[PDB]
Amino acid sequence: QKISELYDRVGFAAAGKFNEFDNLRRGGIQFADTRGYAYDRRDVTGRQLANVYAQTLGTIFTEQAKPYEVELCVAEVAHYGETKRPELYRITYDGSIADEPHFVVMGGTTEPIANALKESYAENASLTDALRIAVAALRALGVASLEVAVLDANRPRRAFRRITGSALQALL
């Protein structure tokens, strides 16, 4: 899998070499739990996590042998019963971090997908419309071999939720 829960409201997607991006996945999971236990769940934010990966990546690249051929996206939504815009961060292999207002595209040829999304994107699109837009711009496919998950802001605590199988087929 290339999409994962990181913390209550913080999700994570990656593209590159599976063992490495997977390894970062694990490191990120690790940091959040300990931090929450020391202070609290609502103190871990998508921003702090996005920052940790970048610093680690830069130091690691400078002192290691081969750079991590990975591209990361950390996502965050608001808590239950609160209003706030979703935040997307993209962390690149060197340590660079970019704040995205609408969408992130990672891995492969990013130009055509990024442009198709540029024409099709609509704020406050429902789940089905955003799924159609995302699959369409991704094609620039079949029901099989698709990994789809959401950070549903309406859930009480754990926002991450996979959308697989028959329900996904019905939606598409």
Partner 1 sequence: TTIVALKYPGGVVMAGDRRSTQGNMISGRDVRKVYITDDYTATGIAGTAAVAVEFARLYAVELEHYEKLEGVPLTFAGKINRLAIMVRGNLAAAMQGLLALPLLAGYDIHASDPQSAGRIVSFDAAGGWNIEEEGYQAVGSGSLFAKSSMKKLYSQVTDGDSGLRVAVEALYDAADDDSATGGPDLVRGIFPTAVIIDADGAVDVPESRIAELARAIIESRS
* Binding residues for a copy of itself (CB under 8 A): 18-19, 23, 54-55, 58, 95, 97
Q: Which segment (9-17, 37-45, 98-106, 137-145) binds partner 1 by CB under 8 A? A: 37-45
Of the candidate residues 19, 40, 109, 124, the single one contacting partner 1 (CB under 8 A) = 40
The footprint of partner 1 on residues 9-28 (CB under 8 A) is: 26
Q: Establish if 99 lies at the interface with partner 1 (CB under 8 A).
A: no
Q: Decide which of partner 1, a copy of itself, none touches 66; Cβ closer than 5 to 8 Å per partner kind.
A: none
Residue 85 burial by CB count (10 A; 0-12/13-18/19+): exposed, middle or buried? exposed
| CA separation, residue 3 to residues 59, 160, 162 (Å) | 25, 10, 9
Of the candidate residues 19, 37, 101, 141, the single one contacting partner 1 (CB under 8 A) = 37
Burial track 130-151 (b if 16+ CB lie within 10 A, e otherwise)? bbebbeebeeeeeeeeeeebbb
Q: Which is nearer to partner 1, 33 or 111 (CB)?
A: 33
Q: Establish if 119 lies at the interface with partner 1 (CB under 8 A).
A: no
